[PDB]
């Protein structure tokens, strides 16, 4: 039922750098445009896509430099619209709307590209206060003994936010613009590998398991 | 007969005291007689038990001079020597798995909301696994051996030793609401000292020693 | 860990070490025969088949935990016909001797690891989630 | 943990493995991976048992590659390493006498006719003494110590080892219908593990390894 | 008089025994008296014959100790020494082309479906060309000389020798359902021993010797 004679190889493929460190489609947000809102806001986290979330959660601590590649896409009901991708670091007010003063900043880095141009790239360096990203955190963000402070959220782990604005928002045509975000870690250093997760997910903010049953992982013989 | 500072504890060491990931704990303005063994309350290992867990900085926030310094000082940095003794006769049987999970994010079953400060921060009392099989982590107990692990087998190996270094992505952190380590004692095979249940207790004794302890801010 | 890590890789090959740990009392004693059937060969059904293949007589009385080194094996998913590799089986060599004190029941726990000769080659998504 | 060829067996050797008459077995046109331990079926040592005996060439005529070679090859010449394990708790008591009788001519009681091929050639199953006291030989069990002998005393000595060289008045002989050796396990003192007969079995494990094996005629 | 292991065969070698592509077969955990000549059943070379072919691993799956090892062992790796003898008088005439085709994918004529396990895996019996001119391959017999080839010309050259190394894109492969080589004997010119057809047989004798044979998995 098989024909496998696999010769011995090197350890190049099974490097942590080559495992975690390559582009993955994390965000696929779409925006209608017709006859003020529908700007792109996205929190930088590895927890949005289940596959990459599990692959990252195999380890406790890990440092990397993040290549964010934005792929535009136009879907008319093609004009070369101008797109601006602004990387707002943690502790800066988020763009309230498309026509917001935060876009005209002298401190927030950004890129100007267009649809027909190659997809845009930024390389955000290792950004956290803490000397390594912690996938799991057995603590609290604040000191208050209240439900207001969420459990297992390190506020240093935030990588900042990415905000994409379609500069040519007002156009004669009614369409949809879909932004694709690709995240690629670089110079990944990992410490304290974790037990691989089995059960599915509920939310990015919490590690609750709902349930291959919670009383038996492997399909019983 | 081990002894750090003033307190002493009688041990039954018969094999190399394995350091967690082979790193002996060390400290490196911030900095001293509180480096002593604290023996936590004995826990009944009944045949129907699930598994216990102590969060070490949480477990020592209220214990003696260490607790006093943690309450006073705004930071800390401390390695932990954990000694676990399952006390039983030659007649008893079973296996305790001692796993020192780094950053053991507690996970409730069949709920949306996360665990609150009450369910996570037991303190000296310690916690109990709702689902030992899944470590209350979404992981598997089968996969729990990646963490610093040891076995108390009621035949041969009647005591376990763990030596946890400073596992954190900062040189120093806060004890009041962060838990670097979680020492979990889980019964893999149920206790079966079938003596007509004359004494089903077979109590477990935990002893934690904060080694290379330093703090910042008097 | 072997299974979870390897399911991220289509092509894999290498030797394994399996540790069987006994969880009975100190007084209890007995014998097991642990046999390894290489790939292709039908899994053993009787002690006579087990006593002929590459086996070890694991004794609880002397040795608490036994280690068996499985030589290098290989398999791939790559139409779909899956794959098959050799088995490992355990047969009751003798009764389980237990005094009046210790329970009649006992438990055996399994452990597996890959030696330094293991290799993972072609990276693919794991269908677990 | 003894191992010859591919198969391995875990032993509890604690004293010099005495060679029968102090001769280590050796082979001297005739001559090879069949030199491996064969563990025979476990035998129940009940309190009312008499004694068991295996004829080694007879015992190995049907076992694996050794059996295949014996069935194929017209001659043989082989030493035998015999390992006997009486498995019991500290609570049990009794004595097994392991005697490797050379040329043990079976003798029926109160009959004229001799033993037939059925009564003598048990094979892997092995035989049972009708009169253990007389060895089914006309001899006495009291006199049975002239042969290569060892003691499994359920206190101290829980395993026996025998190393039989080529005992025959020819360089080579036939396995199909000649028995150089007879390994006999005889309970001198009845098993008295008086635990309310929870488990009266206390089974014996025989393991025979044909060492320095050669044959003539493919 | 050639001889490998125990078996011997009388040869009529008169010219250098050409190795297939000039490589003498060799073996390189895996590894032994089965390296002996196996003489297959004689085949009648009638004047109206087409051509015969043996798949060497298929041809030796059921023959003696080699067959036993192949049935037992999950892998193999073996070179092949093929000796072909067309036995005839000085009066007979004709030409046998001996071609050792590597990976001879059998091709049915005027059908959609491929050849099944029955038509391909003849075994010791061997196969017969439906269309010798096209090698049952879509190729031409005119082009068949790229493969390791020899000529039995009933004048001068009355025997052929081929020495096939391990031709496979893996160090080892499976014998049960893979055929590295295909030894094909094809009569280029029809037998014309016009003696009034007293004996039209002129039988062909094939003899295969697996050289440098090794296996993986007992």
Swiss-Prot record, chains B, D, E:
Disulfide partners: none
Protein's cellular compartments: Virion; Host cytoplasm
Assembly: Interacts with capsid protein VP1 and capsid protein VP3 in the mature capsid.
Function: Forms an icosahedral capsid of pseudo T=3 symmetry with capsid proteins VP2 and VP3. The capsid is 300 Angstroms in diameter, composed of 60 copies of each capsid protein and enclosing the viral positive strand RNA genome.
Protein name, entry field: Capsid protein VP2
Organism name: Human enterovirus 70 (strain J670/71) (EV70)
Stretch of the intact protein here: 84 to 313 of 2194
